[PDB]
């Protein structure tokens, strides 16, 4: 059991350099075969490792970013620092650091060399925008009597930066058939998503819905009322 | 640069025989040289190398048999080998090692011309000239094949031609192959329809270079 | 002083071959001074580090003399300089000009000027760099597996010798006729507790 | 540069028998340059197989795998719905070291007809300036579903967006949502917003419109 | 003590269409092996060094891949002088340990060309010295695969047939077969009929091309 963190500003301007900090324990970096690799994941792609550094510290880059790239170790602190320059709004993804270790056996014959598990990785968003407040509008029932006594409405949150956003009804009270859909970018470098609750249209006139929005980068931690509305 | 080859040619079994190879552009007393086998019909060979320093490496069929040297008097190739056996006949090839522009080893970028060397006790004479007429028919489709079939000759290179080169159209000259009695033969066929065999005249030239030998010879349709 | 016991605790030694003196010897002569050479080859190779002989190392890199003394350890350490993407940093002369005397180095690090046409800098055609670097790669197989050598050489000149195995010494018996031996003083006697 | 494949994109098997997926290689290379990883959705990677032909540590005997040159495949017998995740195929041969392409493996379902509702903008976003009309499509399988929008029967595009929930784990289900976000004055020249869902499910398009003005 | 199979053997492939060989050796050569290109009567050429990489003056067409036990050489655009052998070489065991594959010729391909086959008896001149020598021709046949039998009496005959075939033409892409016995006198007048038998796959069934002494 070996543990591995990642730290940095989730929050970095564009074409602009970040350093990104990996402390592991239950290892250490003087030990043959042990390496420390650096690895990107864009939200909904393929993985993608990019660095490796080796206990003689000996540096492996990828070949498609090898020019801003560097990564280097500390057996003392057991640290590593991975400094990556001029970031894109496309460069949000997340980021892991992990072990690499290999197998032999009486001859050396190499059994293969694999991954250890990775640790908690860091969610790194790139954007030159400000900070927004989330704002809360509400979506409600269309005015029916029963319809097969099955309806929905919820909480859409719009203009908020950056991901993620929490969401709660009725003081948790109310997660039955609820759906949070996955943040959504706009056009404007800025982002959607909406909280939606399938109550039946008997329970409309009978229960109120509260939603309560928690957005601790901007602070804001919204109550909303939804309710249902006639043509 | 440029590995020729000069010294080739046929010797009786148990001879001894020098293979020079002159060098153009390159060091042969700084460079890895490699003397290499190639069969008549069949696959390549690699036989010996030296490397820059003079050290030298032999292939272990010929292992204490063939002598590889390097000459900086005329930046050449030298190869001496003796014993001569019947496995001896081929093309042998100086070639250039660890050559190309991008730097990769164990590759023979530059490869001579190659020389003859075949090692036969036949005792080189003239050939042997036989007509093979088409067979006796009407037109068969107004096709008919005549030709010339060479025996007992020995050595190449042969030369058969029709009407002095002048009747190649339809022409397959099959190559020479090897008897066991040391001589060789081939055959030449040539295709006209059975309308032009009573009407045209024939003619087959011969010539066999090493022994001076010449022989025409007429091919005309026989019947039965 | 030169405990060679430690030698036979390390690695299985893939090659573990003394020359002319036996491993059993060497712990009792005393040489005068003992030059440790150590490098990384390929297992192929490791034949070729010996008295006398041909090759690639054995000509252009490392030349043992013909009359050696001493002896080879050559262990495989695939654990080592196996590197997956390939270890590009152990590097061998494949190109020269002459054969090395014994026991001497060659660090030049110029383009090897083999043809007609000079290099002077331009590394274009028949301009070569003699460094190729092994692959080592974790996949290789035995002959192309990085294997360490140390060459142990032994000097016994008319100098002072001062490297040499350990003595034993056993324990110490009183009051009874014995055979002693006090760092070379041989003799025969009855030891007591004395007070010069 | 060595590309790997795998192959189906998204496999859909329910838990219980057998799952097989494949992994192939554009350029040859050994065996044991080739891992087999595990991710959950928001979940760090875990190892799965190392060497593609030797089980990590702690995998259960229901995980294997065998493969040759350019062409391996994995398989996971007992799976349940927990063990269901993202798998890939990653190479040691040479740097860059990449990954699979990741197959998502799902539960197989009876194929449903989601519900779908509608939701207009609220007043206080039509007060905003920018309005945005969201539609939902609940309760279906599998994911895949067209969605249109159109305002007075007018092909509308380039000013939609769709978002996707995961796959539930109750009822194995899932959720869409078509949001189309427009101007005031686009907003305004207009009577009636509609969207059409089509499914396997729905046996005929289904539209449905609402009108700004009169609800 | 390095053995590689190659293949195909032989490539028959039209003009611009994208070929591909396999080299397979005993033990693992990794990056050491290279292709080289030989015509036919012509010193080789090399083409893929490093089992990876194009050589300097080389058309981008081909591509060296490959490793382990197993390497592959493609070419994208065979233009039509492309039509060669290509050989694979190890360079592991160099030294001493230095061994070539086997090879495969490139043929231009065409439509199936049906052989003429003809029966050519020894000449009387041939006969006074001896020496018979019987003729059984097929031309303009493909592929190069075909089977001929020496009937004699109704009995085939076998180990003592010279047979050669002559390089594919230029104009027709076909072959040329010839099988010839050679018998002594007294064997040439113990027998009357002799035939040669014909199989080839531009023909449905084999064909029979007789001649009798005593006719002819
Ligand atoms: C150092 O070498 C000795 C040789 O006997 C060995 O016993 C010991 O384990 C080695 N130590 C390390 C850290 O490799």
């Given at each position: 059991?070996?543990?591995?963190?990642?730290?940095?500003?989730?929050?970095?301007?564009?074409?602009?350099?970040?350093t990104?900090?990996?402390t592991?324990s239950?290892?250490?970096?003087?030990?043959?075969?042990?390496?420390?690799a650096?690895?990107?994941?864009?939200?909904?792609?393929?993985?993608?490792?990019?660095?490796?550094?080796?206990?003689?510290?000996?540096?492996?880059?990828?070949?498609?970013?090898?020019?801003?790239?560097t990564?280097?170790?500390?057996?003392?602190?057991?640290?590593?620092?991975l400094?990556?320059?001029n970031?894109?709004?496309?460069?949000t993804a997340?980021?892991?650091c992990?072990?690499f270790?290999?197998?032999?056996?009486?001859?050396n014959?190499?059994?293969?060399?694999?991954?250890?598990?990775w640790?908690?990785?860091?969610?790194?968003?790139?954007?030159?925008?400000?900070?927004?407040?989330?704002?809360?509008?509400?979506?409600?029932?269309?005015?029916?009597?029963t319809?097969?006594?099955?309806?929905?409405?919820?909480?859409?949150?719009?203009?908020?930066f950056?991901?993620?956003?929490?969401?709660?009804?009725?003081?948790?009270?109310?997660?039955?058939?609820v759906?949070?859909?996955?943040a959504?970018?706009?056009?404007?470098?800025?982002?959607?998503?909406?909280?939606?609750?399938?109550?039946?249209?008997?329970?409309?006139?009978?229960?109120?819905?509260?939603?309560?929005?928690?957005?601790?980068?901007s602070?804001?931690?919204?109550?909303?009322?939804?309710?249902?509305?006639?043509? | 640069?440029?590995?020729?080859?000069?010294?080739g040619?046929?010797?009786?079994?148990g001879?001894?025989?020098?293979?020079?190879?002159?060098?153009?552009?390159?060091?042969?007393?700084?460079?890895?040289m490699?003397?290499?086998?190639?069969?008549?019909?069949?696959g390549?060979?690699?036989v010996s190398?030296?490397?820059?320093?003079?050290?030298?490496?032999?292939?272990?069929?010929?292992?204490?048999?063939?002598?590889?040297?390097?000459?900086?008097?005329?930046?050449?190739?030298?190869?001496?080998?003796?014993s001569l056996?019947?496995?001896?006949?081929?093309?042998?090839?100086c070639?250039?090692?660890?050559?190309?522009?991008?730097?990769?080893?164990?590759?023979?970028?530059?490869?001579?011309?190659?020389?003859?060397?075949?090692?036969?006790?036949?005792?080189?004479?003239?050939p042997?000239?036989?007509?093979?007429?088409?067979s006796?028919?009407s037109?068969?489709?107004?096709?008919?094949?005549?030709?010339?079939?060479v025996?007992?000759?020995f050595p190449?290179?042969?030369?058969?031609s029709?009407?002095?080169?002048?009747?190649?159209?339809?022409?397959?000259?099959?190559?020479?192959?090897?008897?066991?009695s040391?001589?060789?033969?081939?055959?030449?066929?040539?295709?006209?329809?059975?309308?032009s065999?009573?009407?045209?005249?024939?003619?087959?030239?011969?010539?066999?270079?090493?022994?001076?030998?010449?022989?025409?010879?007429?091919?005309?349709?026989?019947?039965? | 002083?030169?405990?060679?016991?430690?030698l036979?605790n390390?690695?299985?030694?893939?090659?573990?071959?003394?020359?002319?003196?036996?491993?059993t010897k060497?712990?009792?002569?005393?040489?005068?001074?003992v030059?440790?050479?150590?490098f990384?080859?390929?297992?192929?190779?490791?034949s070729?580090?010996?008295?006398?002989?041909?090759?690639?190392?054995?000509?252009?890199?490392?030349?043992?003399?013909?009359?050696?003394?001493?002896?080879?350890?050559?262990?495989?350490?695939?654990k080592?300089?196996?590197?997956?993407?390939?270890?590009?940093?152990?590097?061998?002369?494949?190109?020269?000009?002459?054969?090395?005397?014994?026991?001497?180095?060659?660090?030049?690090?110029?383009?090897?000027?083999?043809?007609?046409?000079?290099?002077?800098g331009?590394?274009?055609?028949?301009?070569?760099?003699?460094?190729r670097?092994?692959?080592?790669?974790?996949?290789?197989?035995?002959?192309?597996?990085?294997?360490?050598?140390?060459?142990?050489?032994?000097?016994?000149?008319?100098?002072?010798?001062?490297?040499?195995?350990?003595?034993?010494?056993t324990?110490?018996?009183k009051?009874?006729?014995?055979?002693?031996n006090?760092?070379?003083?041989?003799?025969?006697?009855?030891?007591?507790?004395?007070?010069? | 540069?060595?590309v790997?494949?795998?192959?189906?994109?998204?496999?859909?098997?329910?838990?219980?028998?057998?799952?097989?997926?494949?992994?192939?290689?554009?350029?040859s290379?050994?065996?044991?340059?080739?891992?087999?990883?595990?991710?959950?959705?928001?979940?760090?990677?875990?190892?799965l197989?190392?060497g593609?032909?030797?089980?990590?540590?702690?995998?259960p005997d229901?995980?294997?795998?065998?493969?040759?040159?350019?062409?391996?495949?994995?398989?996971?017998?007992?799976?349940?719905?927990?063990?269901?995740?993202?798998?890939?195929?990653?190479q040691?041969?040479?740097?860059?070291?990449?990954?699979?392409?990741?197959?998502?493996?799902?539960?197989?379902?009876?194929?449903a007809?989601?519900?779908?509702?509608?939701?207009?903008?609220?007043?206080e976003?039509?007060?905003?300036?920018?309005?945005?009309?969201?539609?939902?499509?609940?309760?279906?399988?599998?994911?895949?579903?067209?969605?249109?929008?159109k305002?007075?029967?007018?092909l509308?595009?380039?000013?939609?967006?769709?978002?996707?929930?995961?796959?539930?784990?109750?009822?194995?289900?899932?959720?869409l949502?078509?949001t189309?976000?427009?101007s005031?004055?686009?907003?305004?020249?207009?009577?009636?917003?509609?969207?059409?869902?089509?499914?396997?499910?729905?046996?005929?398009?289904?539209?449905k419109?609402?009108?700004?003005?009169?609800?």
């Amino acid at each position: 059991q070996i543990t591995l963190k990642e730290s940095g500003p989730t929050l970095v301007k564009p074409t602009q350099t970040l350093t990104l900090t990996c402390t592991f324990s239950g290892f250490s970096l003087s030990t043959s075969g042990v390496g420390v690799a650096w690895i990107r994941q864009p939200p909904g792609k393929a993985l993608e490792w990019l660095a490796l550094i080796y206990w003689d510290n000996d540096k492996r880059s990828s070949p498609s970013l090898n020019n801003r790239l560097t990564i280097t170790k500390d057996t003392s602190k057991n640290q590593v620092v991975l400094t990556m320059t001029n970031m894109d709004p496309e460069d949000t993804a997340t980021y892991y650091c992990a072990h690499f270790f290999s197998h032999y056996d009486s001859s050396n014959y190499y059994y293969g060399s694999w991954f250890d598990p990775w640790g908690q990785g860091t969610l790194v968003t790139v954007s030159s925008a400000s900070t927004k407040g989330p704002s809360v509008f509400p979506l409600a029932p269309s005015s029916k009597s029963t319809s097969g006594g099955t309806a929905a409405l919820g909480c859409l949150v719009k203009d908020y930066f950056p991901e993620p956003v929490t969401v709660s009804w009725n003081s948790g009270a109310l997660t039955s058939g609820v759906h949070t859909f996955p943040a959504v970018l706009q056009s404007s470098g800025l982002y959607s998503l909406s909280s939606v609750v399938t109550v039946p249209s008997s329970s409309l006139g009978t229960q109120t819905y509260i939603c309560n929005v928690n957005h601790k980068p901007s602070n804001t931690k919204v109550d909303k009322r939804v309710e249902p509305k006639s043509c | 640069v440029q590995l020729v080859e000069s010294g080739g040619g046929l010797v009786q079994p148990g001879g001894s025989l020098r293979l020079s190879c002159a060098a153009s552009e390159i060091t042969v007393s700084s460079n890895y040289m490699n003397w290499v086998r190639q069969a008549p019909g069949k696959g390549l060979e690699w036989v010996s190398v030296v490397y820059p320093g003079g050290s030298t490496f032999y292939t272990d069929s010929v292992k204490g048999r063939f002598t590889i040297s390097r000459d900086n008097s005329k930046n050449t190739l030298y190869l001496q080998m003796n014993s001569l056996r019947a496995e001896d006949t081929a093309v042998y090839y100086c070639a250039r090692e660890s050559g190309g522009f991008p730097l990769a080893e164990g590759a023979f970028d530059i490869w001579g011309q190659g020389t003859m060397v075949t090692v036969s006790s036949a005792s080189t004479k003239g050939p042997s000239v036989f007509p093979l007429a088409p067979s006796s028919k009407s037109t068969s489709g107004g096709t008919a094949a005549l030709g010339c079939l060479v025996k007992d000759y020995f050595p190449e290179p042969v030369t058969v031609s029709w009407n002095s080169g002048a009747l190649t159209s339809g022409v397959h000259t099959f190559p020479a192959v090897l008897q066991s009695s040391g001589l060789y033969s081939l055959s030449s066929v040539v295709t006209v329809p059975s309308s032009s065999l009573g009407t045209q005249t024939y003619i087959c030239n011969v010539n066999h270079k090493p022994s001076n030998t010449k022989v025409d010879k007429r091919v005309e349709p026989k019947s039965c | 002083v030169a405990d060679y016991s430690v030698l036979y605790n390390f690695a299985p030694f893939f090659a573990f071959k003394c020359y002319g003196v036996s491993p059993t010897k060497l712990n009792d002569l005393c040489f005068t001074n003992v030059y440790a050479d150590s490098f990384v080859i390929r297992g192929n190779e490791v034949s070729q580090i010996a008295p006398g002989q041909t090759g690639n190392i054995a000509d252009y890199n490392y030349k043992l003399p013909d009359d050696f003394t001493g002896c080879v350890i050559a262990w495989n350490s695939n654990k080592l300089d196996s590197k997956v993407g390939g270890n590009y940093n152990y590097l061998y002369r494949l190109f020269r000009k002459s054969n090395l005397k014994p026991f001497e180095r060659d660090i030049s690090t110029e383009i090897y000027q083999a043809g007609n046409k000079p290099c002077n800098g331009v590394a274009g055609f028949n301009c070569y760099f003699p460094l190729r670097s092994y692959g080592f790669r974790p996949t290789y197989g035995v002959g192309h597996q990085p294997y360490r050598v140390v060459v142990l050489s032994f000097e016994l000149l008319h100098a002072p010798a001062t490297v040499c195995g350990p003595k034993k010494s056993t324990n110490l018996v009183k009051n009874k006729c014995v055979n002693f031996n006090f760092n070379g003083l041989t003799g025969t006697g009855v030891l007591t507790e004395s007070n010069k | 540069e060595i590309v790997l494949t795998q192959s189906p994109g998204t496999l859909s098997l329910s838990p219980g028998e057998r799952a097989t997926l494949s992994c192939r290689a554009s350029q040859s290379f050994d065996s044991r340059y080739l891992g087999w990883y595990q991710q959950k959705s928001g979940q760090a990677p875990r190892l799965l197989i190392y060497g593609a032909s030797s089980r990590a540590t702690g995998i259960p005997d229901r995980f294997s795998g065998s493969g040759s040159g350019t062409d391996f495949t994995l398989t996971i017998s007992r799976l349940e719905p927990e063990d269901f995740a993202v798998y890939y195929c990653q190479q040691f041969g040479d740097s860059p070291f990449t990954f699979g392409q990741g197959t998502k493996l799902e539960i197989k379902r009876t194929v449903a007809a989601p519900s779908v509702f509608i939701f207009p903008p609220s007043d206080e976003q039509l007060k905003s300036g920018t309005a945005s009309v969201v539609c939902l499509l609940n309760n279906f399988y599998p994911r895949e579903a067209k969605v249109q929008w159109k305002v007075d029967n007018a092909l509308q595009s380039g000013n939609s967006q769709e978002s996707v929930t995961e796959q539930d784990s109750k009822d194995s289900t899932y959720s869409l949502s078509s949001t189309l976000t427009l101007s005031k004055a686009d907003y305004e020249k207009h009577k009636v917003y509609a969207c059409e869902v089509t499914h396997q499910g729905l046996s005929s398009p289904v539209t449905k419109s609402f009108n700004r003005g009169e609800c």
